[PDB]
Amino acid sequence: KKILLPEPSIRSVMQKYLEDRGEVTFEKIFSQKLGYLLFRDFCLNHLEEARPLVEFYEEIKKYEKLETEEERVARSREIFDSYIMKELLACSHPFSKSATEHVQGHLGPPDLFQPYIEEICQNLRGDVFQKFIESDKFTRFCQWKNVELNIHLTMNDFSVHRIIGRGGFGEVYGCRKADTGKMYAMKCLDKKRIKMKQGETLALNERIMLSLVSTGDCPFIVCMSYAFHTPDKLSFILDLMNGGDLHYHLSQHGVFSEADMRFYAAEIILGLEHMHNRFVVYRDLKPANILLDEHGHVRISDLGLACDFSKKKPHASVGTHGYMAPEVLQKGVAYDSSADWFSLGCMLFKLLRGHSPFRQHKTKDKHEIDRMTLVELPDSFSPELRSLLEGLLQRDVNRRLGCLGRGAQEVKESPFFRSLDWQMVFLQKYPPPLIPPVNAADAFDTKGIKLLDSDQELYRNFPLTISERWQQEVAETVFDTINAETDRLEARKKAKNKQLDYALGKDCIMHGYMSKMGNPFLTQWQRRYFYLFPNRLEWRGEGEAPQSLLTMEEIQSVEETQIKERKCLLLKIRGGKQFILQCDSDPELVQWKKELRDAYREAQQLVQRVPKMKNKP
């Protein structure tokens, strides 16, 4: 159940694993949630040289998050005086002359210390970062990274609760990830229902779109943290929204007022801005696809019909009729974010009148709604609401609100939102109008179907884990508590050796734990500590020197094999013998394969040019 970290000896394998990918740079470890938490622990408590450099960084970050100048003026005094001015007194400021110039005169905004941020990174990008790598904190980073890169989720990793959503090709459950206790939403799609309706592209596209958006921690979009699949189900691990969709609440509460709709419009706009900044068109904005959380705030969900116009624009008529833009409903017309703004105007119109803007007099047929392609706004609408809707529902894209160059900002500046402070909207400070009290997210609604290997290979690259999402979940739940339990455990292992290293001082390449196979009929897997040398591969037992080894000359091939649905390495020896090794994690399997392949190929090519060592007839 609980997450368990590998032993500190994992550092030898993980460090070479990351170095082969350039992931041991200051820029890449400092910008990770868990890496930052470990780097600051090293700097604050284990290095007086870097302690003032990081305290200055954190005080700046706390200053950037400040809301009002009433607070920015008071805090900027302490930060400048305590950290910048005190050193100039003792004439020991390690920042460029010009860096202080930009901040000095600027007196009587949140981004005033940005020139200093670059200077702080320079003072840490280097020798301070070197001692951190050599420190025990980078070893703890390798312990956590090994867990992240060994994630293989199944249904058993979650405690599934009641159903919170039905529709499409499956249903959605509330669930709890057992190892950290994080509450998520599991969107579980049946593959048989997908293949029956040829909707494989739709399901595959949803994760590709979720992957483009699930970064940055957006509070107005149902983001994704994991994606895995069983032989029969596609599982999306998403943000929990147990308040139902607007399509349901629109029929229970009824039509909304202008001010109650200003709340929903504000949060959807910020959500659309996040997708448009990442070049994603939603194309299916309607009250059914807008969920409520426990408090009443909303998110954009179900990115199945979402498209990516990063390199080439789309032009097909895809979406829900009654909300599609003129540059979309017709065929062969390219478009981009301009479609979502027209969809917003159609959706916002529905929250006020209870029906689609073009579904007049509760018509039922679909072609009765797509006819009106150019707009009669009810008299009860305020003057500012008309100016917003008219801009959002203009037939022309050149005269459309939100399509004039600045994007979502043009919609924020509408006089309908004069009363709003968009910073407070982002912080979810404004009170939601409807707090949900349970069968609140249903939609508008066969066996003997084949599931060949050609179908299972369509979902081949479906498994995915968002690194930013996983590290955040860990950091807020068990990261502090697991490091403490691991520290108390590693200290007992270290203190026990006194009352009780073979790789140091030599030319050892890599060392770690593997499990060679003895008699396979006995499930005999012996965990030995292995030491890789340029010419041999040694392993040892419990508190004993390496009994035997395996020379690089003997190895003919390193191959990957499966034993009882468990990945192992297959070493073929010169005498026709076989040597099987099970690794405890995916990165260990990858690195041991590369390093063993490199070693035996180099060693065999080197012995060839040594008459004392090579083989002769």
Partner: protein, 339 residues
């Protein structure tokens, strides 16, 4: 051309050396020794079997005490054995896995080793608190270390795959004298008893006699058709034997400046890895690639004995200074004492 002349009279000097040699072949060693009695069947049995090395054994060396011996193995370790008790005196872990040769100082206070690290590492055995620390790392060669032998506790002679030999000063670490001349990877060397001279076999199928103090080469002995992998001095210092990949051992005299005898047989085709004489020089022991050590009548060129006990290539051998026993190291990770 001045270069074409120096090559013309160079080939013209080589014919003078061959003629001077052929002017001395009045008789053969086989004719001289035709009268003396044969040695019979030298029957040696495995007295000790030294176990510990985890991979191939590449080289060995006896101490002057005729009891302690050092060994270098593919397992990146040096082991100093007590041949009488089979107990390990020291298990030195090496800093480079690619070891090829090892040496035991006459005093028994220092040992040396080396290989593809291109460094001769001197280890001090008797330290302050009974440790085995590296006392010096002799760096200077541009190729792998193939052999090394102590003169005393301050000078040592090395051979390398850079086609050179070298004389080192241990305390200062300097490459005192260099011995250039070979055109191929120098494989083995052997010191004369008086230690003013030493011979060296290389992959150019030639062996050279060098003067340690003068730093020059005095005589160059040719004859082998393949790489010379081993070499050892005759006890009286006037001759030396070589072993090569041509499946022959050959004997050369310094005063006659030519080959005297060839130790071969159509029954043997594998190369020779190591050679050594008995205390009196009457026996010539050679380790072969067919997992065997053959005992040769040095005076009559007849095969007199065989040491069968290793399941892989016998990579090195050596006779104690008192001539009591013969050690044999092989690619099967075992050392066996024969007597």
């Amino acid at each position: 051309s001045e270069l074409d002349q120096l090559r013309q009279e160079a080939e013209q000097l080589k014919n003078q050396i061959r003629d001077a040699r052929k002017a001395c072949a009045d008789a053969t060693l086989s004719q001289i020794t035709n009268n003396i009695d044969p040695v019979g069947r030298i029957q040696m049995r495995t007295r000790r079997t030294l176990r510990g090395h985890l991979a191939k054994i590449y080289a060995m060396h006896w101490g002057t005490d005729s009891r302690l011996l050092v060994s270098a193995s593919q397992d990146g370790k040096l082991i100093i054995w007590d041949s009488y008790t089979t107990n390990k005196v020291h298990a030195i872990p090496l800093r480079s896995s690619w070891v090829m040769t090892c040496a035991y100082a006459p005093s028994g206070n220092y040992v040396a080793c080396g290989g593809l690290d291109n460094i001769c590492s001197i280890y001090n055995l008797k330290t302050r608190e009974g440790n085995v620390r590296v006392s010096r790392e002799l760096a200077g060669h541009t190729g792998y270390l193939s052999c090394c032998r102590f003169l005393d506790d301050n000078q040592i002679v090395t051979s390398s795959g850079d086609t050179t030999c070298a004389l080192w000063d241990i305390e200062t670490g300097q490459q005192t004298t260099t011995f250039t001349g070979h055109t191929g990877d120098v494989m083995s060397l052997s010191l004369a008893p008086d230690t003013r001279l030493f011979v060296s076999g290389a992959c150019d199928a030639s062996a050279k006699l060098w003067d340690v103090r003068e730093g020059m080469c005095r005589q160059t002995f040719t004859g082998h058709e393949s790489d010379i992998n081993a070499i050892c001095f005759f006890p009286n210092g006037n001759a030396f034997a070589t072993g090569s990949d041509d499946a022959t051992c050959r004997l050369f005299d310094l005063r006659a400046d030519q080959e005297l005898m060839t130790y071969s047989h159509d029954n043997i085709i594998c190369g020779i890895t190591s050679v050594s004489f008995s205390k009196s020089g009457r026996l010539l022991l050679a380790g072969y690639d067919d997992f065997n050590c053959n005992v040769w009548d040095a005076l009559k060129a007849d095969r007199a004995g065989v040491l069968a006990g290793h399941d892989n290539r016998v990579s090195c051998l050596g006779v104690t200074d008192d001539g009591m026993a013969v050690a044999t190291g092989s690619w099967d990770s075992f050392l066996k004492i024969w007597n």
